[PDB]
Design a protein around this ligand. Structure first.
Ligand code: CLA
Ligand code: CLA
Ligand code: CLA
Ligand code: CLA
Ligand code: CLA
Ligand code: CLA
Ligand SMILES: CCCCCCCCCCCCCCCCCC(=O)OC[C@H](CO[C@@H]1O[C@H](CO)[C@H](O)[C@H](O)[C@H]1O)OC(=O)CCCCCCCCCCCCCCCCC
Ligand SMILES: CCCCCCCCCCCCCCCCCC(=O)OC[C@H](CO[C@@H]1O[C@H](CO)[C@H](O)[C@H](O)[C@H]1O)OC(=O)CCCCCCCCCCCCCCCCC
Ligand SMILES: CC1=C(/C=C/C(C)=C/C=C/C(C)=C/C=C/C=C(C)/C=C/C=C(C)/C=C/C2=C(C)CCCC2(C)C)C(C)(C)CCC1
Ligand SMILES: CC1=C(/C=C/C(C)=C/C=C/C(C)=C/C=C/C=C(C)/C=C/C=C(C)/C=C/C2=C(C)CCCC2(C)C)C(C)(C)CCC1
Ligand SMILES: CC1=C(\C=C/C(C)=C/C=C/C(C)=C/C=C/C=C(C)/C=C/C=C(C)/C=C/C2=C(C)CCCC2(C)C)C(C)(C)CCC1
Ligand code: OEC
Ligand SMILES: [Ca+2]
Ligand SMILES: [Cl-]
Ligand SMILES: [Fe+2]
Lengths: 37, 28, 34, 447, 82, 335, 340, 62, 35
């Protein structure tokens, strides 16, 4: 497991891996906002 | 127990960094 | 007037949440195996 | 600056083909995504990692990669110190911020083009000199990297050797095979059953040794390209465009994706069954072992035992005469593994060693690997498609093999797509046939 | 290229819509939720509760074996605390 | 002679050939001819093959008691596995035919040629100044042949587990596959039928709509097809009348009005769908099988409440339990 | 006249065209879809098949279904107010009343829909080749969900409305009918598979033989919605396939009719095969083959192999697939190979 | 030291959160990034230090 | 039998050589316009 100290951040690290996917999604948010040029 | 609090913030963060740009109008 | 791109992105996430709720239920509800 | 009057939205990134500056931001921001994943995932794996439990039973694919390099493991793949795992994870995750910074910067702040803000970094796709030079740069960077592995193996600690004399353990390689006849021989090896081409590597000496050759060869070619230009044939054969160069690298990755798929599925050495699961053949071999071991203890003479077909219940012959395991496992008689080898003789499986040299650690090893075959469902239910829910498991060898085949294939499609476009873009009809000068209308009727 | 109906784009964007639907849409959601959570759904469709597939000891299935006296037969299946 | 080799290259590349022998053709034509000839002779006259390597020869040729439906070319022996088995690797042809020699010769030559066939579908398009990507559409059926003839055997460790070259033999491959992998319960397969069903659907869709909105240029007692001449300037059908109808069938915005967006969709859907189904076989070649919902829903006590997924499992066991009768000696089928 | 005023209103060009057909279509179509989505989440199949079939019980999108009625029901229409349910709704659900509900309503919905095709075509003034085509899906639904069980013992052996529940219908037909060996089915797949080829190949052909009518790379905008010239080179398309395949189209009017013919004809052939399976008149065996296999224990074909698979399918599935039979098959009577 | 570690580590998180949102809108809207070139620099500089703090401070907690 | 192997190998070499030296012979040139 995570080193005794960082254990507080255990829940945080549980979500981090998925973040890259969001970037792929974000790019679509942007294009929608700029009215798909 | 409920790290859904995390996702929530980092999730709305994405659209925020472009929403603020729709407010300050520029460079989209 | 509410900007369309906001309507979709909010309704978009709103869909990912409920459907994601479904996938969680696959490991907890009656649809489990435990 | 760039909008609909360049490309469509769904082809947006193609608007950056001639925007060196912004096109660098992409690559720097992208490279951050790769470092981010590697980092954040390692920490995710460690956070779930259970020391007194097999790695392959925990859905790990990065921590076993670190383990192979001799880090945090010991005798028999026993996990000693989880700190190196934590380090490799956090360091990456940090570096992702540094790269991500530059990426974002160059994409929305910095010069939209490079040619003027610096002639050294600015480039022209048709500039065969700049292209071969930038290529030369990366050919060195990769070259040093190949040597970074050699260093870790020979000096900074070693690697996990499953073939360890005293049994699987981290070993310092201090005798790399440098014989070219041996090294480059692998390249001349068949890709079929038995002769396994590159995947047939079975000792760290060759691995470390081969990396020495590659490392030097790569840098050597790196320097060559800095101080040269494409020849004559080299220019009259290829297409020189931003897309064309992409296509060439796309098929390259596709080919490497297929090779990697077969590596994680077949190879035992650079993919230890202690960290990953047992390989496909290894598992089927283990079952024959297991029940040969059982039944023999019940007083059965395995050597002369006759199966339903009259072929040999436990032991039979390979097409070239070697004594092998019986049953459907006759297809995996090409398997070699630390646990099984001490039973092998000069003609294959020795009936005498089988009869009284079977060791307890081998029996339970066979049992382990037998009960952990790379068989599973998408929802991760270990076993045959007809198994019952209970054992939540899918061999890491299965995850990796499948994922990288899908990627390798689609990249071959991406290759074809981008190579076909480049040929038409160059010649100049990638946007339709000229209504006026329609080529076909100028050719004789074959009818 | 147009008909009488008010262009969706305008309606989904109008503040008036959301002032309405911020009430209506969740309302239906909560209603459907209660429909299940109050166990009413179980009775509306005669769907067995997790503790209502068999009797305690019985391991046989309440298969309906004749059409005309099926309803009566079904009721009899509920009798054995099933 | 302007230069023999220069002329040769000009002839090969020539777009004035009845059939475009390309540079890919130089490899395709011979390989496809060996495959076909060997196939035809085998399917008719080849002797029984010990497919499972258990000395249990399976006859699949016409002359040996088969008909078109049952007849097939039997995969190489399981004793051979993934080993390369050319004719010059056998003591005799008798031996070569017994261990399923022809099979490898065919599949290898076909897959090679069928790949160059894709390569040629680019070349000719290049020589004629038209856009590529037609070959990209053909990559989907080819990727399936690859998955069924090469990828799955590699994954499973033997060419004997590759799909046989025959009708009924193809049925065996499927039935068994379902047993060992539960393919019907796999997303990639489901995407495949979606592409295949939708394909046939859209093929009929497009077909009908177009043929139904044809401009009148024919007599009442004259074929409506003659109202079109090869090499027309203008269109032969009213696409605006087509869109007007289909737009009213469902609703306007759910209807195509752009022929280019139409034909792209017509091409994209099945190709993409089949691509996944090909990836499905290639994925389940490494035993990453379909969803396993066996004994999922259970009651409050713990009794197992069956679903259709369980009824599927019973059918699957029966396949599993009966297939390759005498080939298994041990409890688990890990091969 | 009120009729022509009623007509006027119906045939008015709206967002969603109603029409006379709509009076039949929309009510049934909605009830069919609604009935499924209802049963899918709420109604069980415990008292009818001894199965869980709804989200409420724990099934997922794949395993959910609206299962057929009991075999006891026979071919009963299972009306809500019929002798079985006796007006009761809860009982009606438990007796699989929703199945005949979905089936019959959906049946009329398919009638209304083709009528819509006919009605709309007439108004717009276009040829009804869209209605002719839609006959293939009708034949299939009619043959499989109605005619087939009408030949069997009851509605019970009809395909249940659901993902997995359809998969068993496939495995069943293999095991019991040897459906893959049927000539009519083979023509079926040939049409679907061949139809999915035509779809692909034609689309790809057109997109890659296009003329340049714009200055952008994304050639989609560069299309003229108002006819005029052909958007793609038919002549180039012709010479291409003529050199790579040897054969090629040269009459857009025939090419498109061909795209109608192939998949529609296939579906119709597959329908006929199913109509024969209703009377169990299957294409199960080859007599010449069986006679040799009996006398000669060394004669083996891939055909013989498959039949053994069927025997296994029938034996191991029948008990839980046909509860009404009260099947009891001892372990020793179960056909099994070695080890497995 | 322990709390001091949790302070630095947690603060490093909130700063990054602020930085990750900050830098984008900074470079984007050209209303400045010259007054924000001051802000960004201080955030970037501080960030590195924080990482080095948590770095050395780690071998003291775990 | 050892002969057949040789024959085949020679044959395959021929076509493979024809293929490599083929695209090498300035293939991009061979096309309607720009070359
Ligand atoms: C090194 C890899 C690489 C690179 C750098 C490029 C670069 C490029 N490609 Mg490309 N391509 C690649 C691999 C690559 N490709 C592969 C492997 C394929 C085969 C599938 C393709 C197929 C392809 C096509 C068909 C096209 C391009 C195009 C382009 C250009 C415009 C970019 C674009 O359309 O972005 C836009 C990006 C998107 C619209 C995103 C697509 C999203 C994908 C399809 C979904 C991925 C699924 C994901 C894993 C699931 C996430 C779950 C989700 C819920 C979050 C650009 C030069 C276009 C062009 O102009 O050609 C020159 C074009 O038409 N490429
Ligand atoms: C790997 C993913 C990736 C990357 C790196 C890029 C990169 C780029 N794209 Mg792009 N794109 C992508 C995927 C990607 N794309 C996909 C999948 C699609 C299809 C939907 C597109 C469609 C697309 C179009 C249509 C266009 C681009 C353009 C561009 C370029 C200019 C970006 C821009 O307009 O800034 C605008 C920036 C903003 C509106 C603000 C966004 C916020 C920033 C960028 C993200 C912040 C990251 C993180 C949260 C902050 C970390 C801070 C921390 C380090 C401190 C840039 C090089 C444009 C181009 O050609 O350049 C001229 C263009 O027109 N893209
Ligand atoms: C590609 C490399 C790769 C490989 C081999 C793995 C392998 C693994 N991951 Mg992993 N992962 C990856 C990339 C990868 N991951 C990435 C990029 C992310 C970031 C989002 C993650 C995030 C992640 C998390 C958060 C977790 C894992 C876990 C796991 C393990 C369990 C696998 C599982 O249950 O997944 C099953 C997943 C699926 C069945 C989804 C398949 C999705 C496919 C690819 C979609 C294809 C559709 C297609 C794209 C549609 C496009 C078509 C359209 C354009 C028309 C396994 C060892 C788990 C673990 O370690 O627990 C043991 C876990 O909790 N991974
Ligand atoms: C793919 C990598 C890459 C490349 C090719 C460039 C290229 C460029 N950057 Mg840049 N940058 C990058 C990554 C990269 N950057 C990253 C990751 C960041 C985030 C920290 C930045 C942040 C950044 C800023 C803030 C600025 C630039 C600028 C520039 C341009 C001027 C050159 C310069 O500043 O160098 C000058 C420095 C050197 C020549 C020497 C640097 C050597 C470093 C200290 C050592 C690197 C070690 C390396 C990792 C290992 C290699 C050794 C190995 C071979 C053994 C140039 C086009 C400037 C610009 O836009 O001007 C036009 C500018 O103001 N960059
Ligand atoms: C990945 C890194 C990389 C890349 C992209 C390039 C790219 C290039 N190199 Mg190169 N090179 C590299 C690394 C690299 N080099 C290294 C490390 C060295 C040192 C050994 C060299 C030494 C080198 C020399 C000496 C020359 C080049 C040349 C060239 C150019 C033409 C290549 C060509 O036409 O090949 C096309 C290849 C063929 C037509 C032959 C095909 C036959 C192949 C080899 C066998 C079949 C492959 C098979 C499918 C794979 C199976 C594996 C096999 C072992 C069985 C091109 C720009 C040439 C040039 O223009 O000089 C500037 C040149 O003369 N390179
Ligand atoms: C017009 C659309 C339409 C059509 C064609 C149908 C058709 C059908 N529905 Mg249905 N339904 C509809 C709309 C429709 N529904 C709507 C909108 C609802 C929601 C309220 C329902 C709710 C519903 C339920 C709840 C049930 C059906 C059922 C049925 C089926 C049997 C009903 C029956 O016996 O008909 C009877 C036919 C008639 C009454 C027509 C009579 C017309 C004549 C001209 C009038 C004569 C009356 C006069 C008094 C006779 C004098 C003679 C004298 C000797 C007494 C049948 C397939 C049942 C079913 O599916 O069973 C499985 C069932 O249980 N429907
Ligand atoms: C207005 C527009 C709406 C029009 C609706 C038309 C109907 C659309 C199809 C309805 C799909 C329902 C799916 C659903 O309900 O799943 C709902 C289920 C419910 O989930 C289940 O909950 C149960 C509760 O006990 C159990 O816990 C199970 O474990 C759990 O899986 O979710 C799933 O897990 C499946 C994910 C959804 C996948 C749907 C993909 C459909 C793709 C095909 C599309 C049709 C072509
Ligand atoms: C029988 C048919 C019953 C139809 C019942 C009503 C359905 C309502 C649909 C509303 C959607 C719509 O209007 O278009 C929404 C928009 C059209 O946008 C339109 O813009 C117009 C501008 O003048 C008007 O504003 C319209 O109001 C607006 O709808 O999308 C379209 O361009 C194409 C939609 C095609 C959808 C086909 C089904 C595919 C669904 C995708 C789901 C897979 C994920
Ligand atoms: C916090 C934190 C962190 C992280 C950071 C990051 C990296 C972030 C990112 C973030 C992000 C990056 C986010 C994003 C998001 C996105 C999203 C969320 C999206 C969505 C989308 C949608 C919803 C869509 C929609 C749509 C549709 C559906 C249709 C079409 C149209 C549109 C497109 C509109 C760190 C590490 C420092 C540490 C810890 C803390
Ligand atoms: C029965 C009956 C009836 C009827 C009723 C009705 C009609 C109902 C309806 C109902 C309904 C009408 C329902 C609905 C539902 C729906 C749903 C439930 C949906 C869901 C969806 C989803 C979930 C989605 C998903 C997805 C997709 C698919 C796409 C992709 C993405 C996503 C994920 C989003 C009556 C009374 C008459 C009479 C008696 C009998
Ligand atoms: C261009 C562009 C784009 C892209 C972008 C990108 C790709 C970005 C990237 C970004 C990135 C690449 C970022 C990164 C970040 C990272 C970070 C920010 C880091 C953090 C770290 C930390 C925070 C530390 C520490 C720790 C540990 C050691 C353990 C405990 C926990 C924690 C995590 C705290 C898009 C598509 C959107 C759109 C268009 C434009
Ligand atoms: Mn032909 Ca695939 Mn069932 Mn192990 Mn043999
Ligand atoms: Ca945790
Ligand atoms: Cl079989
Ligand atoms: Fe067409």
């Amino acid at each position: 497991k995570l080193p005794e100290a960082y254990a507080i951040f255990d829940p945080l690290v549980d979500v981090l891996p998925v973040i890259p996917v969001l970037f792929l999604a974000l790019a679509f948010v942007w294009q929608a906002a700029v009215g798909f040029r | 127990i409920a790290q859904l609090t995390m996702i929530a913030m980092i999730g709305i963060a994405g659209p925020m960094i472009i929403f603020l740009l729709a407010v300050r109008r520029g460079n989209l | 007037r509410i900007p369309l791109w906001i309507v979709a992105t909010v309704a978009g996430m709103g869909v990912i949440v409920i459907v994601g709720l479904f996938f969680y239920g696959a490991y907890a509800g009656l649809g489990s195996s435990l | 600056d760039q909008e609909s009057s360049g490309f469509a939205w769904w082809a947006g990134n193609a608007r950056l083909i001639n925007l060196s500056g912004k096109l660098l931001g992409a690559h720097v921001a992208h490279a951050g995504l790769i470092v981010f994943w590697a980092g954040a995932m390692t920490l995710f794996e460690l956070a779930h990692f259970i020391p007194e439990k097999p790695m392959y039973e925990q859905g790990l694919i990065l921590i076993p990669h670190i383990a192979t390099l001799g880090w945090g493991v010991g005798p028999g793949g026993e996990v000693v110190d989880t700190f190196p795992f934590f380090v490799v994870g956090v360091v990456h995750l940090i570096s992702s911020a540094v790269l991500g910074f530059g990426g974002v910067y160059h994409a929305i702040r910095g010069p939209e083009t490079l040619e003027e803000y610096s002639s050294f970094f600015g480039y022209d796709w048709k500039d065969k000199n700049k292209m071969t030079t930038i290529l030369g740069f990366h050919l060195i960077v990769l070259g040093i990297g190949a040597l970074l592995l050699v260093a870790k193996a020979m000096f900074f600690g070693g690697l996990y050797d499953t073939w360890a004399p005293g049994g699987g353990d981290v070993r310092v390689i201090t005798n790399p095979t440098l014989d070219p006849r041996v090294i480059f021989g692998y390249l001349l090896k068949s890709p079929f059953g038995g002769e396994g081409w590159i995947v047939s590597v079975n000792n760290l000496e060759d691995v470390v040794g081969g990396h020495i050759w590659i490392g030097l060869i790569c840098i050597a070619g790196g320097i060559w390209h800095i101080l040269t230009t494409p020849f004559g044939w080299a220019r009259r054969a290829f297409i020189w465009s931003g897309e064309a160069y992409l296509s060439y690298s796309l098929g390259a990755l596709s080919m490497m994706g297929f090779i990697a798929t077969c590596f994680v599925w077949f190879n035992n050495t650079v993919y230890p069954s202690e960290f990953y699961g047992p390989t496909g053949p290894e598992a089927s071999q283990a079952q024959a072992m297991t029940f040969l071991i059982r039944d023999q203890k019940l007083g059965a003479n395995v050597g002369s035992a006759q199966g339903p077909t009259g072929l040999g219940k436990y032991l039979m012959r390979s097409p070239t005469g070697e004594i092998i395991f019986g049953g459907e496992t006759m297809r995996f008689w090409d398997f070699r593994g630390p646990w099984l080898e001490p039973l092998r003789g000069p003609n294959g499986l020795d009936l005498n060693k089988i009869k009284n040299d079977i060791q307890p650690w081998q029996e339970r090893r066979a049992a382990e690997y037998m009960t952990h075959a790379p068989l599973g469902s998408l929802n991760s239910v270990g076993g045959v498609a007809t198994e019952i829910n209970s054992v939540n498991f899918v061999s890491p060898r299965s995850w990796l093999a499948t994922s990288h085949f899908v990627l390798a294939f689609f990249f071959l499609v991406g290759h074809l797509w981008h190579a076909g476009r480049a040929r038409a873009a160059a010649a100049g009809f990638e946007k339709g046939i000229d209504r006026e000068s329609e080529p076909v209308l100028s050719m004789p009727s074959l009818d | 290229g147009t008909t009488g109906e008010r262009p969706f784009s305008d309606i989904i964007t109008s503040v008036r819509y959301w002032v309405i639907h911020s009430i209506t849409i969740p309302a239906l959601f909560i209603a459907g939720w209660l429909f299940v959570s109050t166990g009413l759904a179980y009775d509306v469709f005669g769907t067995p509760r997790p503790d209502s597939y068999y009797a305690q000891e019985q391991r046989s299935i309440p298969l309906v074996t004749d059409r005309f006296e099926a309803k009566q037969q079904v009721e009899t299946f509920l009798e054995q605390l099933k | 002679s302007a230069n023999l080799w220069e002329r040769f290259c000009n002839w090969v590349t020539s777009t004035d050939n009845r059939l475009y022998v390309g540079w890919f053709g130089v490899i395709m034509i011979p390989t496809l001819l060996a495959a076909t000839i060997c196939f035809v002779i085998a399917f008719i006259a080849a002797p029984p093959v010990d497919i499972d390597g258990i000395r249990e020869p399976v006859s699949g040729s016409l002359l040996y008691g088969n008909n078109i439906i049952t007849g097939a070319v039997v995969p190489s022996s399981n004793a051979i596995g993934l080993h390369f088995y050319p004719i010059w690797e056998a003591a005799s042809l008798d031996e070569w035919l017994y261990n399923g020699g022809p099979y490898q010769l065919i599949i290898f030559h076909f897959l090679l040629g069928a790949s160059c066939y894709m390569g040629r579908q680019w070349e000719l398009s290049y020589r004629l100044g038209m856009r590529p990507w037609i070959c990209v559409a053909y990559s989907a059926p080819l990727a399936s042949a690859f998955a069924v003839f090469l990828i799955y055997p590699i994954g499973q460790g033997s060419f004997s587990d590759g799909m046989p070259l025959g009708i009924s033999g193809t049925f065996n491959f499927m039935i068994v596959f379902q047993a060992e992998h539960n393919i019907l319960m796999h997303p990639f397969h489901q995407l495949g039928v979606a592409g295949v069903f939708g394909g046939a659907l859209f093929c009929a869709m497009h077909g009908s709509l177009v043929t139904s909105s044809l401009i009148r240029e024919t007599t009442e007692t004259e074929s409506a097809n003659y109202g079109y001449k090869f090499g027309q300037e203008e269109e032969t059908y009213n696409i605006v009348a087509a869109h007007g109808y289909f737009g009213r069938l469902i609703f306007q915005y759910a209807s195509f009005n752009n022929s280019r967006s139409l034909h792209f969709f017509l091409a994209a859907w099945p190709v993409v769908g089949v691509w996944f189904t090909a990836l499905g076989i290639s994925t389940m070649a490494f035993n990453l099988n379909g969803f396993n919902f066996n004994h999922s829903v259970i009651d409050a006590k713990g009794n197992v409440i069956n679903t259709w997924a369980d009824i599927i499992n019973r059918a699957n066991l029966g396949m599993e339990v009966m297939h390759e009768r005498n080939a298994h000696n041990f409890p688990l089928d890990l091969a | 006249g009120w009729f022509d005023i009623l007509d006027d209103w119906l045939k008015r060009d709206r967002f969603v065209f109603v029409g006379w057909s709509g009076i039949l279509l929309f009510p049934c179509a909605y009830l069919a879809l609604g009935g499924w989505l209802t049963g899918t989440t709420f109604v069980t199949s415990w008292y009818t098949h001894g199965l869980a079939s709804s989200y409420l019980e724990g099934c997922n999108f794949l395993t959910v279904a609206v299962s057929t009625p009991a075999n006891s029901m026979g071919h009963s229409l299972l009306l809500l107010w019929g002798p079985e349910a006796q007006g009761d709704f809860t009982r009606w659900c438990q007796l699989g009343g929703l199945w005949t509900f979905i089936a019959l309503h959906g049946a009329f919905g398919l009638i209304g829909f083709m009528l819509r095709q006919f009605e709309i075509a007439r108004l717009v003034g276009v040829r009804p080749y869209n209605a002719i085509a839609f006959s293939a899906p009708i034949a299939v639904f009619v043959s499989v969900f109605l005619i087939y069980p009408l030949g069997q013992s009851s509605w019970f052996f009809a395909p249940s409305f659901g993902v997995a529940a359809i998969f068993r219908f496939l495995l069943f037909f293999q095991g019991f009918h040897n459906w893959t060996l049927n000539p009519f089915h083979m023509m079926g797949v040939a049409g679907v598979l061949g139809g999915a080829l035509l779809c692909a190949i034609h689309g790809a052909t057109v997109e890659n033989t296009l003329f340049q009518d714009g200055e952008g790379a994304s050639t989609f905008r560069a299309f003229n919605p108002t006819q005029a010239e052909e958007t793609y080179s038919m002549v180039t398309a012709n010479r291409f396939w003529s050199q790579i395949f040897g054969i090629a189209f040269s009459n857009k009017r025939w090419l498109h009719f061909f795209m109608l013919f192939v998949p529609v004809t296939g579906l119709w052939m597959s329908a006929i095969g199913v109509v024969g399976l209703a009377l169990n008149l299957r294409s199960y065996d080859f007599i010449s083959q069986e006679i040799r296999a009996a006398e000669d224990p060394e004669f083996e074909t891939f055909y013989t192999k498959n039949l053994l698979l069927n025997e296994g399918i029938r034996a191991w599935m029948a008990p839980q697939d046909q509860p009404h039979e009260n099947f009891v098959f001892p372990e020793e009577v179960l056909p099994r190979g070695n080890a497995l | 030291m322990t709390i001091l570690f949790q302070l630095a580590l947690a603060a490093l998180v909130i700063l990054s959160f602020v930085m990750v949102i900050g830098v984008p809108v900074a470079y984007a809207s050209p209303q400045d990034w010259d007054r924000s070139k001051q802000l960004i620099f201080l955030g970037s500089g501080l960030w590195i230090a924080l990482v080095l703090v948590v770095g050395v401070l780690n071998f003291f907690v775990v | 039998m050892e002969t057949l192997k040789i024959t085949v190998y020679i044959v395959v070499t021929f076509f493979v050589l024809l293929f490599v030296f083929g695209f090498l012979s300035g293939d991009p040139a061979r096309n309607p316009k720009r070359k």
